[PDB]
Design a protein around this nucleic acid. Structure first.
Ligand SMILES: CN[C@@H]1[C@@H](O)[C@@H](O[C@@H]2[C@@H](O)[C@H](O[C@H]3O[C@H]([C@@H](C)O)[C@@H](O)[C@H](O)[C@H]3N)[C@@H](N)C[C@H]2N)OC[C@]1(C)O
Ligand SMILES: [Zn+2]
Ligand SMILES: [Zn+2]
Lengths: 98, 91, 25, 81, 214, 96, 102, 127
RNA sequence: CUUGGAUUUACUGAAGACUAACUACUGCGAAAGCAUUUACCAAGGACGUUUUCAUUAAUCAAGAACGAAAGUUAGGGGAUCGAAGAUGAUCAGAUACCGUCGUAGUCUUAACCAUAAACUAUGCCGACUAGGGAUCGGUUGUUGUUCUUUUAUUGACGCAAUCGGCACCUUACGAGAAAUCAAAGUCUUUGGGUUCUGGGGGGAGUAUGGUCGCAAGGCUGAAACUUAAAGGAAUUGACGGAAG
């Protein structure tokens, strides 16, 4: 049968899309299909925030922010719980969780 | 009528030397014996005398060229490269 | 049998059958 | 709606639609009398002007073409005819 | 078996007078033995310092200034401008989805024969009353913006020497100029000269160099 | 847009074709414009512009060779040079 | 002189020593590439047709361009007779008997 | 006042580097890795090993005459992953808990502007 | 691989590739495909038009253009990955997965090859049938907004109409074996025009003849014989080195 009306990707209006390599296994995967995450995290772990504040020379000096965008192939995304198998009526939800 | 299907000018070699060797010769011999446009008088009267020598029967000017064509790709690139480096130096 | 390899088996077979043919015009 | 007036639709709607889509097609462009403020001469100019229509011996350019209706130059006035 | 840190001559780093503070930091090298001078030595070494430290204001925390030594006065080593760059975190903070990134670069030579490559950067800005979900500028508008970037950097950068150039970069007047003379094309934000390359240097003149560490 | 301006001059104006005709039109003073193809020999091109200087005639240097200049005049033969004798409904004289 | 040619200039019939009237890049289709300059030492670095890199005096001369007649070897000789005519004006080095046949 | 070095930390999932240089980066002060702290090959990225390596580097930079360090942080970079390995955070915390004054922390992971091809193939490493 | 200092740090340089981040239920193209700047070349859809011709049209055997990747020939390049090969592990064995190299290849130029789950597994042209909110391009009317200037013939943005698109959401008119479908509807109340294809499963896209290709192969394409099911969608259960 046909599981999804979008065929598990986002490619209605064109023929081909360049691939990207998976973060974990380096699998070529279409960009429109790759599961993609934008992560902002603090460059210093929280339990060392005050220790670095003590040890810093400066006063009122901001903490640099780590930026990266993560691409996963479906296997490496399910095996990392980044997405999880959902029910037939719940697969049809594009709105992010809360 | 079309006298030969594919051998063309290399029909003078008959069945000898192998088809790949005759086909490689055909590519360069057509260029070797072709008429080219003169860059001086603008007529199609440039023919090869010997390798690297190209004469115009109209204006009687001889230009040094390639073995089998009037101009080679490397020489064309040099003219642009020498053109470019000329103004970048004189400015 | 993964029909892909079934076709590949026939290709190699048909390649060899064409060798035996050319042996005797 | 099951029962409707196809013959006498709302003129606001009939003006809301597309030129070919009304009960009978009718162009929604017009002809306008272009008159620069400098002179009193009158020139007839199509509202959608593909060419830059000039005026008489006064030597003025009246409109400049666009993708739709050509806007009048600075200091020209028009009247729908 | 020998301790290499006992053969170390700790020189000191001196910035140009164009910056607020020229007390950058320390350095160390093997001393000037008969078979190894400490004069040739030090020369060339490149230092990457934060412009906040050089101007004493965290408004400059992201630009990193590259300074490389070109003469040593005893224990003082004098540097000259060697390039500009943002830090990675700032540039990764600026690049945001649902907007139009636009760049531009140009090769330009100073008044005193310093050939540079200058990189601009800007972004499209969402209007105060904007309701549509994205802020995208049309492609020809971006061509216009990039053209203006290139022309303005060319004219504003080739008309002042390298020292005047580095004095001109700190307030970021080229950036605000790109800001001002594009608002009739498309509103822009976060306009910057994010990177400057020192490609070719002219023949070295101490009389011009000393004029910068007076 | 010179190829357009010269194309109209051929269509409506007056002209003469070839090196010998041009020189005669320079001697009689009837030439209004002399046009020289790019691959015309310099000795002939310098000869033409010396005639043009004596007779107070402007010279236009055509970008292409005689194959191109002949085609631009709507002809099937090469034109190394030509002179305009009467511009016709064209402003090639003022536009160059 | 090679010192007057910027990086990447294609040059032929290049002198090895100043004033020897040409030694390098002389056959059809061959040339010498100028790689870089060492103005303080008056030396130029060039790329020879074989692939070797060589430092030459910047006062050594060369001729701008590529030696004409390039592409001879692209066409096969096809015949012993063409080789006969080729070496008939070069030297007596053809035909070649194999050492194992002796 | 404070004398500044450059503590360049290379953290990867195979080993962690804590290695201090002068402000130009030309002169090496110390270079300690988790492979000098653990006997086993698997443990070289363990945060404990990185912390010990960072303390050793602290002692060396102190006996050299270095009081403060600017932190330079990077992952493996290039075609590899962009997140720094486990030892980097622990090494950074150790350096800020040894009496060393901490300058400006930054991440300089080598990021390609689209580059060569990663190893593995198009199906990738298959486990 | 490393005390011949490997790895790691800074500067300069040399190569070939690639075009990140922006980048999306967004754009263009007949399809395959197409993503750095700029300039030139010719081309194109849509829109606007009170411009022009007047049936010039639709679909199409035969016959033609283009056609990812891999592959072929000859030059040039050959950084990186890397079929084959060599080699270390795991293993009962692994000439596999995993690790280290690494030949073709990957790139380009001039020619071949003509196939993909080349997919929307949905021929093309035309008409009609139900509601909604977005988005791209063009055009048409319009502000408590931001920008030029504070003011115009600014630009962006905001609010209503339309034409064209890529799509999406709800319902089930109606359809369907169902999954599902605004077309897969207007089909036993069976007929708008037209091209191609299928007729139980295998044997078999095989053999043979023809034909194209340098080859690899492509296109066209049977029969004997064999067999009671093969298959589609959904249900309940059981099971999973699947999740909670
Ligand atoms: C050496 N390559 C071989 C190739 O020769 C071929 O092998 C066939 C094999 O398929 C045939 O096998 C055949 O016959 C057997 C047998 C029980 O009757 C049946 O399973 C069935 O009819 C058929 N598979 C066998 N009879 C001959 C081999 N040469 O196919 C397998 C292969 C590995 O490609
Ligand atoms: Zn993966
Ligand atoms: Zn000639």
């Amino acid at each position: 049968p046909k599981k999804r009306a979008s065929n598990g990707r986002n490619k209605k209006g064109r023929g081909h899309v360049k691939p990207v390599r998976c973060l974990n296994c380096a699998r070529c995967v279409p960009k429109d299909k790759a599961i993609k995450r934008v992560t902002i995290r603090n460059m210093v772990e929280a339990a060392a925030v005050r220790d670095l504040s003590e040890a810093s020379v400066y006063a009122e000096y901001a903490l640099p922010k780590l930026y990266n965008k993560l691409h996963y192939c479906v296997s490496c995304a399910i095996h990392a719980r980044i997405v999880r198998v959902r029910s037939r009526t719940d697969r049809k939800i594009r709105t992010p969780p809360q | 009528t079309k006298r030969t299907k594919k051998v063309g000018i290399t029909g003078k070699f008959g069945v000898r030397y192998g088809s790949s060797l005759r086909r490689q010769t055909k590519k360069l011999e057509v260029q070797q014996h072709a008429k080219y446009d003169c860059s001086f008088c603008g007529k199609r009267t440039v023919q090869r005398g010997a390798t690297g020598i190209w004469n115009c029967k109209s204006c009687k000017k001889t230009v040094a060229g390639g073995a089998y064509t009037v101009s080679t790709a490397a020489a064309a690139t040099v003219r642009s490269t020498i053109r470019r480096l000329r103004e970048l130096a004189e400015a | 049998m993964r029909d892909k390899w079934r076709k590949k088996r026939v290709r190699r077979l048909k390649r060899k059958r064409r060798k035996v043919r050319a042996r005797s015009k | 709606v099951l029962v409707q007036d196809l013959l006498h639709p709302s003129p606001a709607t009939e003006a809301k639609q597309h030129k070919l889509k009304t009960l009978v097609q009718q162009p929604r462009s017009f002809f306008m009398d272009v008159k620069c403020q400098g002179c009193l001469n009158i020139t007839t100019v199509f509202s959608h002007a593909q060419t830059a229509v000039t005026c008489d011996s006064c030597s003025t350019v009246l409109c400049t073409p666009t993708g739709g209706k050509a806007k009048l130059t600075e200091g020209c006035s028009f009247r729908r005819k | 078996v020998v301790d290499p840190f006992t053969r170390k001559d700790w020189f000191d780093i001196k910035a140009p007078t164009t910056f607020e503070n020229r007390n950058v930091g320390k350095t160390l090298i093997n001393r000037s033995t008969g078979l190894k001078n400490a004069a040739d030595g030090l020369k060339g070494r490149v230092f990457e310092v934060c412009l906040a430290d050089l101007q004493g204001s965290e408004d400059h925390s992201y630009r990193k200034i590259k300074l490389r030594v070109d003469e040593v006065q005893g224990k003082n080593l004098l540097t000259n401008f060697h390039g500009l760059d943002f830090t990675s975190d700032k540039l990764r903070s600026l690049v945001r989805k649902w907007q139009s990134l636009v760049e531009a670069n140009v090769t330009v030579k100073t008044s005193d024969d310093y050939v540079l490559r200058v990189f601009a950067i800007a972004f499209t800005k969402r209007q105060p009353n904007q309701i549509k979900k994205t802020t995208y500028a049309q492609s020809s508008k971006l061509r216009e913006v990039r053209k203006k970037m290139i022309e303005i950097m060319q004219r504003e950068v080739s008309n002042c020497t390298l020292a005047q150039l580095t004095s001109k970069l700190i307030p970021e007047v080229i950036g605000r100029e790109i800001e001002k003379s594009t608002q009739t094309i498309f509103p822009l934000q976060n306009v910057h000269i994010r990177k400057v390359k020192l490609l070719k240097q002219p023949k070295f003149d101490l009389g011009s160099l000393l004029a910068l560490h007076g | 847009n010179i190829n357009s301006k010269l194309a109209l001059t051929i269509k409506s104006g007056k002209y003469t074709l070839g090196y010998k005709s041009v020189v005669k039109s320079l001697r009689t003073g009837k030439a209004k414009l002399v046009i020289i193809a790019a691959n015309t020999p310099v000795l002939r091109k310098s000869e033409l512009e010396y005639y043009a200087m004596l007779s107070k005639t402007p010279v236009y240097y055509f970008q292409g060779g005689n194959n191109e200049l002949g085609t631009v005049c709507g002809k099937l033969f090469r034109v190394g040079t030509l002179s305009i004798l009467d511009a016709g409904d064209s402003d090639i004289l003022s536009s160059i | 002189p090679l010192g007057a040619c910027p990086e990447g200039t294609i040059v032929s019939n290049v002198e090895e020593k100043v004033g020897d009237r040409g030694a390098l890049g002389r056959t059809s289709g061959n040339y010498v590439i100028i790689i870089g300059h060492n103005p303080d030492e008056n030396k130029t670095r060039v790329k020879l047709p074989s692939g070797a890199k060589k430092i030459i005096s910047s006062d050594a001369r060369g001729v701008i361009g590529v030696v004409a007649g390039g592409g001879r070897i692209d066409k096969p000789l096809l015949k012993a007779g063409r080789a006969f005519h080729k070496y008939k004006v070069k030297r007596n080095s053809w035909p070649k008997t194999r050492g194992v046949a002796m | 006042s404070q004398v500044f070095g450059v503590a360049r930390i290379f953290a990867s999932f195979n080993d962690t580097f804590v290695h201090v240089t002068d402000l130009s980066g030309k002169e090496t002060i110390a270079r300690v890795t988790g492979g000098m702290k653990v006997k086993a090959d698997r443990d070289e990225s363990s945060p404990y090993a990185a912390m010990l390596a960072a303390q050793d580097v602290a002692a060396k930079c102190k006996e050299v005459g270095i009081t403060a360090v600017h932190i330079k942080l990077r992952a493996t970079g290039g075609t590899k992953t962009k997140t720094p390995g486990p030892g980097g955070q622990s090494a950074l915390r150790a350096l800020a808990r040894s009496g060393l004054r901490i300058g400006r922390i930054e991440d300089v992971t080598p990021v390609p502007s689209x580059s060569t091809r990663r190893k593995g193939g198009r199906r990738g490493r298959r486990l």
